[PDB]
Amino acid sequence: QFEERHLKFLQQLGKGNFGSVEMCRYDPLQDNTGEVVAVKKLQHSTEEHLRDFEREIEILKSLQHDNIVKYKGVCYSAGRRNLKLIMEYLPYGSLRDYLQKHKERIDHIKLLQYTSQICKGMEYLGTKRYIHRDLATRNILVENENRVKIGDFGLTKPGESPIFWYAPESLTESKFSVASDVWSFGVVLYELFTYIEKSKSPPAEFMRMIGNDKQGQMIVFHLIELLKNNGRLPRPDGCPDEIYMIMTECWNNNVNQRPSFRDLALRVDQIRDN
Ligand SMILES: CC(=O)Nc1cc(Oc2ccc3c(c2)CCN3C(=O)Nc2ccc(CN3CCN(C)CC3)c(C(F)(F)F)c2)ncn1
C-alpha cells in the first residue's frame, strides 16, 4: 500500500527519544503529485519498542472517528526491515501550538467547539475500551479552525512532565481509567481557557503553587498532597464560572462522582446552543 520508493520527504515535524514524525508526499505516479501524509518512525526497534509500535498500529487500525487522528497504513522500508506508520497530515499541528500561534482566530465559541469535539472523540475511544492516559493539548491536533482530532504523539515515551494532567489515583496507585481521562480532560479544558498564555500552563501554575524552587521527587510529593486536599488550578482570566464549574467537577477526587464524557459533550453542546 505504501512503497518506500514513492514516499518522499517534505519536512521534519517532531522528534523525541522514542520516535520521530515527518511530512511526506506519497507519489506512486512519479509526477511530483500525490497525497501528503505524516509518517512516524521508531528511533530504536528493540523487541519492546517494536512490540509497543505494533500495539499502537493495531489500536489505530481499530479507530475511525471524525475527532480521532486518521490512520492510513504502514510502510516497510530498509528492504522490509523497518516499519513506519502513515497517518493523515493535519496542517495546524498540536492544539497547544495552534492556541499560541493563532490567537487571532480563537474566541470562546471556538474553544467550546473544540471542547465538544474532544469529548466526542473520547466517547468513541471508550466504546473501543481504550484508556487514553495522555490527554493534553500537546496530543490533540488541529485540521482547521473548525476541527480538532485527538491523538498521542508518543515521541517522548518539570515543564515537560506529564504528571500535571494526572488524576490523584493515577499519581498514587498508577490507576488509569476512563475516569482519570475525565480528570485529564478537565486539565485540557483549563489549557484551552488559558490560551497557552506564558506562565498559565498546568506545569507552571502547579509549580508556582507548590514552590517554584522545588526539584525532583519533592515536586511529586507536594503535587499529590496538594491535590488530595483540594488544591486546584485557578479559574483562568475571563473564563466563565460555568466553564470553571465543568473543570472543577472533572477534578473530583471521588472517582465515581466525575461526569462521563457523554454528560460532558451534552453539557458543552447545550452551553454552545444556548
Ligand atoms: C503539522 C503537523 O505536525 N501535522 C501532523 C503531525 C502528526 O503527527 C502525528 C500525530 C499523532 C500520531 C502520529 C503522528 C503517529 C501515531 N499518532 C497517534 O496519534 N497515535 C495514537 C496512539 C494511541 C492512541 C490511543 N491510545 C490508547 C491507549 N493509551 C494507553 C494510549 C493512547 C491514539 C488516539 F488517541 F486514540 F488517537 C493515537 N500527524 C498529523 N499531522
mmCIF file of all heavy atoms in Angstrom, residues 13 21 38 40 56 59-60 63 68-69 85 87-94 125 130-134 141 150-153, ligand 1:
data_model
loop_
_atom_site.group_PDB
_atom_site.id
_atom_site.type_symbol
_atom_site.label_atom_id
_atom_site.label_comp_id
_atom_site.label_asym_id
_atom_site.label_seq_id
_atom_site.Cartn_x
_atom_site.Cartn_y
_atom_site.Cartn_z
ATOM 1 N N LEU A 13 8.689 17.066 11.368
ATOM 2 C CA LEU A 13 7.564 17.560 12.178
ATOM 3 C C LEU A 13 7.771 17.527 13.688
ATOM 4 O O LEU A 13 7.259 18.399 14.388
ATOM 5 C CB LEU A 13 6.273 16.821 11.836
ATOM 6 C CG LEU A 13 5.751 16.989 10.411
ATOM 7 C CD1 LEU A 13 4.578 16.124 10.173
ATOM 8 C CD2 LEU A 13 5.410 18.437 10.120
ATOM 9 N N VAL A 21 8.566 12.126 13.671
ATOM 10 C CA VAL A 21 7.495 12.283 12.690
ATOM 11 C C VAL A 21 7.936 13.233 11.594
ATOM 12 O O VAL A 21 8.528 14.284 11.874
ATOM 13 C CB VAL A 21 6.127 12.712 13.330
ATOM 14 C CG1 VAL A 21 5.047 12.843 12.252
ATOM 15 C CG2 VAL A 21 5.675 11.721 14.404
ATOM 16 N N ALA A 38 1.575 12.222 7.176
ATOM 17 C CA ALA A 38 2.511 12.279 8.296
ATOM 18 C C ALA A 38 3.015 10.853 8.521
ATOM 19 O O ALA A 38 2.236 9.879 8.423
ATOM 20 C CB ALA A 38 1.829 12.809 9.553
ATOM 21 N N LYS A 40 5.406 8.323 11.043
ATOM 22 C CA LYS A 40 6.082 8.127 12.320
ATOM 23 C C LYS A 40 7.071 6.964 12.153
ATOM 24 O O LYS A 40 6.718 5.926 11.608
ATOM 25 C CB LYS A 40 5.077 7.824 13.467
ATOM 26 C CG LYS A 40 5.766 7.511 14.797
ATOM 27 C CD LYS A 40 4.766 7.346 15.959
ATOM 28 C CE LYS A 40 5.442 6.932 17.249
ATOM 29 N NZ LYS A 40 4.417 6.857 18.337
ATOM 30 N N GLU A 56 0.454 0.087 18.928
ATOM 31 C CA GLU A 56 -0.072 1.376 18.518
ATOM 32 C C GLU A 56 -0.749 1.254 17.152
ATOM 33 O O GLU A 56 -1.853 1.764 16.938
ATOM 34 C CB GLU A 56 1.072 2.367 18.437
ATOM 35 C CG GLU A 56 0.666 3.725 17.879
ATOM 36 C CD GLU A 56 1.700 4.817 18.030
ATOM 37 O OE1 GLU A 56 2.919 4.529 18.099
ATOM 38 O OE2 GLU A 56 1.283 5.992 17.981
ATOM 39 N N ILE A 59 -4.063 -0.472 17.554
ATOM 40 C CA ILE A 59 -5.066 0.441 18.129
ATOM 41 C C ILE A 59 -5.588 1.361 17.024
ATOM 42 O O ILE A 59 -6.800 1.529 16.858
ATOM 43 C CB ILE A 59 -4.433 1.256 19.267
ATOM 44 C CG1 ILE A 59 -4.207 0.369 20.520
ATOM 45 C CG2 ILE A 59 -5.319 2.491 19.633
ATOM 46 C CD1 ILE A 59 -3.257 0.985 21.574
ATOM 47 N N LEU A 60 -4.679 1.949 16.240
ATOM 48 C CA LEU A 60 -5.095 2.883 15.205
ATOM 49 C C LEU A 60 -5.921 2.275 14.101
ATOM 50 O O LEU A 60 -6.857 2.910 13.616
ATOM 51 C CB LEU A 60 -3.872 3.601 14.644
ATOM 52 C CG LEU A 60 -3.240 4.591 15.617
ATOM 53 C CD1 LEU A 60 -1.817 4.964 15.165
ATOM 54 C CD2 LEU A 60 -4.157 5.845 15.789
ATOM 55 N N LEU A 63 -9.627 2.437 15.007
ATOM 56 C CA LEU A 63 -10.299 3.703 15.279
ATOM 57 C C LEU A 63 -10.658 4.487 14.050
ATOM 58 O O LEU A 63 -9.779 4.821 13.247
ATOM 59 C CB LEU A 63 -9.416 4.587 16.193
ATOM 60 C CG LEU A 63 -8.993 3.961 17.519
ATOM 61 C CD1 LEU A 63 -8.003 4.875 18.230
ATOM 62 C CD2 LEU A 63 -10.175 3.718 18.454
ATOM 63 N N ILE A 68 -10.750 11.777 15.933
ATOM 64 C CA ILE A 68 -9.588 10.939 16.253
ATOM 65 C C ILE A 68 -8.670 10.974 15.035
ATOM 66 O O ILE A 68 -9.151 10.886 13.890
ATOM 67 C CB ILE A 68 -9.964 9.481 16.616
ATOM 68 C CG1 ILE A 68 -10.931 9.468 17.829
ATOM 69 C CG2 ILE A 68 -8.697 8.604 16.829
ATOM 70 C CD1 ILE A 68 -10.332 9.678 19.184
ATOM 71 N N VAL A 69 -7.359 11.068 15.275
ATOM 72 C CA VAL A 69 -6.394 11.066 14.154
ATOM 73 C C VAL A 69 -6.641 9.885 13.230
ATOM 74 O O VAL A 69 -6.986 8.793 13.682
ATOM 75 C CB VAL A 69 -4.944 11.072 14.657
ATOM 76 C CG1 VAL A 69 -4.583 12.413 15.251
ATOM 77 C CG2 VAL A 69 -4.656 9.912 15.609
ATOM 78 N N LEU A 85 4.793 4.256 10.272
ATOM 79 C CA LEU A 85 3.342 4.394 10.367
ATOM 80 C C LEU A 85 2.888 5.623 9.581
ATOM 81 O O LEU A 85 3.458 6.688 9.761
ATOM 82 C CB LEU A 85 3.000 4.521 11.854
ATOM 83 C CG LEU A 85 1.603 5.004 12.234
ATOM 84 C CD1 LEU A 85 0.521 4.083 11.725
ATOM 85 C CD2 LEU A 85 1.511 5.142 13.743
ATOM 86 N N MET A 87 -0.060 8.331 8.552
ATOM 87 C CA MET A 87 -1.284 8.986 9.041
ATOM 88 C C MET A 87 -1.677 10.124 8.129
ATOM 89 O O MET A 87 -0.863 10.643 7.365
ATOM 90 C CB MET A 87 -1.000 9.654 10.415
ATOM 91 C CG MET A 87 -0.433 8.727 11.474
ATOM 92 S SD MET A 87 -1.548 7.424 12.021
ATOM 93 C CE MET A 87 -2.783 8.369 12.970
ATOM 94 N N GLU A 88 -2.927 10.583 8.260
ATOM 95 C CA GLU A 88 -3.338 11.823 7.594
ATOM 96 C C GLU A 88 -2.462 12.991 8.120
ATOM 97 O O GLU A 88 -2.095 13.053 9.313
ATOM 98 C CB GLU A 88 -4.801 12.098 7.968
ATOM 99 C CG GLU A 88 -4.975 13.033 9.161
ATOM 100 C CD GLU A 88 -6.122 12.891 10.141
ATOM 101 O OE1 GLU A 88 -7.283 13.024 9.696
ATOM 102 O OE2 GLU A 88 -5.863 12.768 11.364
ATOM 103 N N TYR A 89 -2.160 13.947 7.252
ATOM 104 C CA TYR A 89 -1.428 15.137 7.646
ATOM 105 C C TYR A 89 -2.424 16.222 8.059
ATOM 106 O O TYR A 89 -3.336 16.559 7.314
ATOM 107 C CB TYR A 89 -0.537 15.629 6.488
ATOM 108 C CG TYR A 89 0.172 16.913 6.848
ATOM 109 C CD1 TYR A 89 1.261 16.907 7.709
ATOM 110 C CD2 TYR A 89 -0.264 18.140 6.349
ATOM 111 C CE1 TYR A 89 1.881 18.093 8.102
ATOM 112 C CE2 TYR A 89 0.365 19.337 6.715
ATOM 113 C CZ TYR A 89 1.444 19.308 7.587
ATOM 114 O OH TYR A 89 2.078 20.455 8.024
ATOM 115 N N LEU A 90 -2.197 16.788 9.243
ATOM 116 C CA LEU A 90 -3.028 17.873 9.785
ATOM 117 C C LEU A 90 -2.220 19.134 9.832
ATOM 118 O O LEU A 90 -1.239 19.188 10.553
ATOM 119 C CB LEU A 90 -3.598 17.507 11.157
ATOM 120 C CG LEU A 90 -4.427 16.231 11.112
ATOM 121 C CD1 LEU A 90 -4.779 15.764 12.527
ATOM 122 C CD2 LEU A 90 -5.693 16.418 10.288
ATOM 123 N N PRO A 91 -2.586 20.146 9.023
ATOM 124 C CA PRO A 91 -1.683 21.296 8.861
ATOM 125 C C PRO A 91 -1.311 22.126 10.063
ATOM 126 O O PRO A 91 -0.227 22.673 10.133
ATOM 127 C CB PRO A 91 -2.373 22.147 7.790
ATOM 128 C CG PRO A 91 -3.127 21.166 6.992
ATOM 129 C CD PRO A 91 -3.662 20.164 8.019
ATOM 130 N N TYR A 92 -2.237 22.223 11.041
ATOM 131 C CA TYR A 92 -2.004 23.104 12.170
ATOM 132 C C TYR A 92 -1.318 22.506 13.335
ATOM 133 O O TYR A 92 -1.092 23.199 14.324
ATOM 134 C CB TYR A 92 -3.283 23.844 12.543
ATOM 135 C CG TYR A 92 -3.675 24.803 11.457
ATOM 136 C CD1 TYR A 92 -4.607 24.449 10.501
ATOM 137 C CD2 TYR A 92 -3.039 26.035 11.331
ATOM 138 C CE1 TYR A 92 -4.927 25.309 9.453
ATOM 139 C CE2 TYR A 92 -3.367 26.911 10.310
ATOM 140 C CZ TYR A 92 -4.307 26.545 9.371
ATOM 141 O OH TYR A 92 -4.613 27.423 8.359
ATOM 142 N N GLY A 93 -0.955 21.228 13.237
ATOM 143 C CA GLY A 93 -0.181 20.596 14.279
ATOM 144 C C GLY A 93 -0.924 20.477 15.596
ATOM 145 O O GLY A 93 -2.147 20.307 15.591
ATOM 146 N N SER A 94 -0.199 20.573 16.715
ATOM 147 C CA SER A 94 -0.876 20.398 18.003
ATOM 148 C C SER A 94 -1.761 21.578 18.340
ATOM 149 O O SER A 94 -1.486 22.736 17.962
ATOM 150 C CB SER A 94 0.099 20.164 19.144
ATOM 151 O OG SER A 94 0.758 21.375 19.474
ATOM 152 N N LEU A 125 -13.562 6.663 21.885
ATOM 153 C CA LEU A 125 -12.469 5.840 22.386
ATOM 154 C C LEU A 125 -12.933 4.901 23.479
ATOM 155 O O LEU A 125 -12.486 3.741 23.539
ATOM 156 C CB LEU A 125 -11.363 6.741 22.953
ATOM 157 C CG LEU A 125 -10.011 6.137 23.218
ATOM 158 C CD1 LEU A 125 -9.270 5.768 21.915
ATOM 159 C CD2 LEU A 125 -9.152 7.097 24.007
ATOM 160 N N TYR A 130 -10.557 1.633 25.190
ATOM 161 C CA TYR A 130 -9.209 2.157 25.393
ATOM 162 C C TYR A 130 -9.250 3.257 26.437
ATOM 163 O O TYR A 130 -10.272 3.946 26.592
ATOM 164 C CB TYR A 130 -8.619 2.752 24.103
ATOM 165 C CG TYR A 130 -8.402 1.730 23.017
ATOM 166 C CD1 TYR A 130 -9.007 1.869 21.777
ATOM 167 C CD2 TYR A 130 -7.560 0.637 23.218
ATOM 168 C CE1 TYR A 130 -8.811 0.932 20.769
ATOM 169 C CE2 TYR A 130 -7.402 -0.336 22.235
ATOM 170 C CZ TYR A 130 -8.049 -0.185 21.025
ATOM 171 O OH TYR A 130 -7.870 -1.088 19.998
ATOM 172 N N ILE A 131 -8.141 3.385 27.155
ATOM 173 C CA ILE A 131 -7.888 4.459 28.115
ATOM 174 C C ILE A 131 -6.824 5.309 27.472
ATOM 175 O O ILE A 131 -5.793 4.775 27.038
ATOM 176 C CB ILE A 131 -7.425 3.913 29.480
ATOM 177 C CG1 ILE A 131 -8.544 3.039 30.069
ATOM 178 C CG2 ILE A 131 -7.027 5.063 30.431
ATOM 179 C CD1 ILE A 131 -8.097 2.011 31.064
ATOM 180 N N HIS A 132 -7.055 6.620 27.345
ATOM 181 C CA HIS A 132 -6.058 7.427 26.679
ATOM 182 C C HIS A 132 -4.763 7.546 27.478
ATOM 183 O O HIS A 132 -3.669 7.224 26.970
ATOM 184 C CB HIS A 132 -6.635 8.809 26.314
ATOM 185 C CG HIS A 132 -5.790 9.560 25.321
ATOM 186 N ND1 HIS A 132 -4.526 10.036 25.640
ATOM 187 C CD2 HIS A 132 -6.072 9.874 24.037
ATOM 188 C CE1 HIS A 132 -4.086 10.642 24.542
ATOM 189 N NE2 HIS A 132 -4.973 10.543 23.543
ATOM 190 N N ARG A 133 -4.876 8.062 28.717
ATOM 191 C CA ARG A 133 -3.806 8.326 29.699
ATOM 192 C C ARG A 133 -3.125 9.678 29.441
ATOM 193 O O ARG A 133 -2.715 10.361 30.397
ATOM 194 C CB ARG A 133 -2.711 7.215 29.777
ATOM 195 C CG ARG A 133 -3.216 5.843 30.159
ATOM 196 C CD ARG A 133 -2.043 4.955 30.488
ATOM 197 N NE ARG A 133 -2.507 3.651 30.956
ATOM 198 C CZ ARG A 133 -1.858 2.906 31.842
ATOM 199 N NH1 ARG A 133 -0.708 3.325 32.360
ATOM 200 N NH2 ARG A 133 -2.358 1.740 32.228
ATOM 201 N N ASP A 134 -2.949 10.043 28.156
ATOM 202 C CA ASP A 134 -2.091 11.165 27.758
ATOM 203 C C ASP A 134 -2.891 12.354 27.218
ATOM 204 O O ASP A 134 -2.370 13.157 26.444
ATOM 205 C CB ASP A 134 -1.078 10.642 26.683
ATOM 206 C CG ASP A 134 -0.298 9.413 27.110
ATOM 207 O OD1 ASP A 134 0.090 9.344 28.277
ATOM 208 O OD2 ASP A 134 -0.113 8.501 26.271
ATOM 209 N N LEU A 141 -4.669 17.388 17.842
ATOM 210 C CA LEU A 141 -4.179 18.036 16.621
ATOM 211 C C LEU A 141 -5.274 18.835 15.962
ATOM 212 O O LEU A 141 -6.472 18.601 16.179
ATOM 213 C CB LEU A 141 -3.624 17.007 15.644
ATOM 214 C CG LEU A 141 -2.262 16.443 16.076
ATOM 215 C CD1 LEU A 141 -2.398 15.205 16.967
ATOM 216 C CD2 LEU A 141 -1.318 16.258 14.900
ATOM 217 N N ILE A 150 -8.186 14.027 18.388
ATOM 218 C CA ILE A 150 -7.336 13.508 19.461
ATOM 219 C C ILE A 150 -6.302 12.550 18.877
ATOM 220 O O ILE A 150 -6.630 11.721 18.018
ATOM 221 C CB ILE A 150 -8.216 12.737 20.461
ATOM 222 C CG1 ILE A 150 -9.246 13.676 21.092
ATOM 223 C CG2 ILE A 150 -7.337 12.053 21.542
ATOM 224 C CD1 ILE A 150 -10.308 12.879 21.839
ATOM 225 N N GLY A 151 -5.086 12.665 19.359
ATOM 226 C CA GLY A 151 -4.000 11.747 19.034
ATOM 227 C C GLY A 151 -3.158 11.467 20.261
ATOM 228 O O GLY A 151 -3.569 11.685 21.414
ATOM 229 N N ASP A 152 -1.941 11.000 20.022
ATOM 230 C CA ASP A 152 -0.970 10.725 21.060
ATOM 231 C C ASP A 152 0.357 10.647 20.308
ATOM 232 O O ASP A 152 0.608 9.651 19.623
ATOM 233 C CB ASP A 152 -1.287 9.396 21.773
ATOM 234 C CG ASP A 152 -0.639 9.301 23.139
ATOM 235 O OD1 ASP A 152 0.290 10.099 23.421
ATOM 236 O OD2 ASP A 152 -1.014 8.398 23.904
ATOM 237 N N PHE A 153 1.115 11.730 20.306
ATOM 238 C CA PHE A 153 2.358 11.723 19.518
ATOM 239 C C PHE A 153 3.249 10.513 19.820
ATOM 240 O O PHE A 153 3.616 9.773 18.891
ATOM 241 C CB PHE A 153 3.091 13.042 19.663
ATOM 242 C CG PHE A 153 2.570 14.135 18.763
ATOM 243 C CD1 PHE A 153 1.553 14.975 19.185
ATOM 244 C CD2 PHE A 153 3.089 14.311 17.481
ATOM 245 C CE1 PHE A 153 1.088 16.017 18.358
ATOM 246 C CE2 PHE A 153 2.632 15.351 16.661
ATOM 247 C CZ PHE A 153 1.637 16.198 17.104
HETATM 248 C C1 LIG B 1 1.955 19.946 11.433
HETATM 249 C C2 LIG B 1 1.965 18.528 11.963
HETATM 250 O O1 LIG B 1 2.829 18.182 12.711
HETATM 251 N N1 LIG B 1 0.973 17.746 11.499
HETATM 252 C C3 LIG B 1 0.779 16.379 11.859
HETATM 253 C C4 LIG B 1 1.569 15.665 12.748
HETATM 254 C C5 LIG B 1 1.156 14.355 13.001
HETATM 255 O O2 LIG B 1 1.921 13.619 13.852
HETATM 256 C C6 LIG B 1 1.378 12.511 14.479
HETATM 257 C C7 LIG B 1 0.425 12.700 15.478
HETATM 258 C C8 LIG B 1 -0.141 11.600 16.140
HETATM 259 C C9 LIG B 1 0.303 10.330 15.739
HETATM 260 C C10 LIG B 1 1.262 10.163 14.754
HETATM 261 C C11 LIG B 1 1.816 11.243 14.114
HETATM 262 C C12 LIG B 1 1.533 8.683 14.584
HETATM 263 C C13 LIG B 1 0.623 7.996 15.625
HETATM 264 N N2 LIG B 1 -0.079 9.096 16.289
HETATM 265 C C14 LIG B 1 -1.030 8.886 17.217
HETATM 266 O O3 LIG B 1 -1.814 9.800 17.467
HETATM 267 N N3 LIG B 1 -1.106 7.648 17.759
HETATM 268 C C15 LIG B 1 -2.068 7.236 18.722
HETATM 269 C C16 LIG B 1 -1.697 6.191 19.559
HETATM 270 C C17 LIG B 1 -2.613 5.725 20.510
HETATM 271 C C18 LIG B 1 -3.893 6.284 20.631
HETATM 272 C C19 LIG B 1 -4.845 5.774 21.733
HETATM 273 N N4 LIG B 1 -4.092 5.119 22.804
HETATM 274 C C20 LIG B 1 -4.989 4.313 23.641
HETATM 275 C C21 LIG B 1 -4.166 3.610 24.745
HETATM 276 N N5 LIG B 1 -3.432 4.602 25.542
HETATM 277 C C22 LIG B 1 -2.643 3.959 26.624
HETATM 278 C C23 LIG B 1 -2.516 5.402 24.689
HETATM 279 C C24 LIG B 1 -3.373 6.096 23.621
HETATM 280 C C25 LIG B 1 -4.227 7.344 19.789
HETATM 281 C C26 LIG B 1 -5.584 8.008 19.879
HETATM 282 F F1 LIG B 1 -5.637 8.773 20.992
HETATM 283 F F2 LIG B 1 -6.587 7.124 20.001
HETATM 284 F F3 LIG B 1 -5.859 8.770 18.827
HETATM 285 C C27 LIG B 1 -3.343 7.790 18.814
HETATM 286 N N6 LIG B 1 0.040 13.870 12.457
HETATM 287 C C28 LIG B 1 -0.695 14.584 11.598
HETATM 288 N N7 LIG B 1 -0.303 15.839 11.296
#
